[PDB]
């Protein structure tokens, strides 16, 4: 699965750099877009993201594993768009930041696997029709 591998690489590299706080062909352009759009979503939805993080109660490895299981039903209302996808990835970046502060940095990779698993499992057909990561870049171009 070239799409899962590419998406995992994009989401994991984005979440790992957001936690660390330092920035590390199609995937290259997608990452640049995700850095701009993602940081923007985290900045404008910081209060909503704080409430969601407090509600989930992430303190250890198991809490990330429970978040991994509940993740498969995030888009249950049948509304699909790039905005909803970037909101999940941005919230994932927000939870990745919190994981670095609670000394649980090893939890960033399974969190990235779970976010990617849900996008590619429940939204594969949609993502493929949308030209995947090329589509993501073209949609957010300004």
């Amino acid at each position: 699965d070239d799409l899962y591998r590419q998406s995992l690489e994009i989401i994991s590299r984005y979440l790992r750099e957001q936690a660390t706080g330092s920035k590390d062909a199609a995937g290259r352009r997608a990452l640049e877009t995700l850095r701009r759009v993602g940081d923007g979503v985290q900045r404008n939805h910081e209060t909503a993201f704080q409430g969601m993080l407090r509600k989930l109660d992430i303190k250890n490895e198991d809490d990330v594993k429970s978040l991994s299981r509940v993740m498969i039903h995030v888009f249950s209302d049948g509304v699909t768009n790039w905005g909803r996808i970037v909101t999940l990835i941005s919230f994932g970046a927000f939870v990745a930041k919190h994981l670095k502060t609670i000394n649980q940095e090893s939890c960033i990779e399974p969190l990235a696997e779970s976010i990617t698993d849900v996008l590619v499992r429940t939204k594969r057909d949609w993502l493929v029709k949308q030209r995947g990561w090329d589509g993501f870049v073209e949609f957010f171009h300004v």
Partner: single-chain antibody
Amino acid sequence: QVTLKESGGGLVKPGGSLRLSCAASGFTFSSYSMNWVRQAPGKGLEWVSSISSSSSYIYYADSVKGRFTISRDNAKNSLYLQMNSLRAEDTAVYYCARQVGATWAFDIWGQGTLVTVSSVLTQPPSASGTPGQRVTISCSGSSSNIGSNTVNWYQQLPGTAPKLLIYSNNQRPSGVPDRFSGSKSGTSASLAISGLQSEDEADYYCAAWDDSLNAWVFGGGTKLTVLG
């Protein structure tokens, strides 16, 4: 100035090869999907091929599969069309067109290049009216095209290249008067001109993406005449 300019057209014998180029100016080429659309003399618009920004997703019309190869060189702001095993049915003006990322509308078109080798959506062939009158043009599709995706309308004045008139069923780009309006209902769509003007005498085409064909499907076009 945001422009596209096609090159490479000419006379070729059946079975021959020809390579078309499309030069992009005034925009970040590497962030847009690009398409080739052709038009046989006196006939409708036919989508040929499309290529995504990073070349990861390529699509072809059934009528050119295996003979045409689309490619792009982002470093040269260029789009290409390699045409092999050319047939008389390939004679047409070939247009380069830019696709909007958020809507999939073809917002910028080149002037076209003539290649001389020697319809899933339906529309009434003609429509007419007197100035000031209201005219309506329908576009009939099905579940996998108009029933699943948005509709775009293009206007082509005689001797000109097509221009984007409506996008996302009823949205007007800048420069399109409020007299034009669009609507979508079920698998049907319609274009309304409320108060016909002299400049509205043109050919009108509807277009939508087809999920089953994995292709862009254009309507056969409607020739609008403004009597008197």
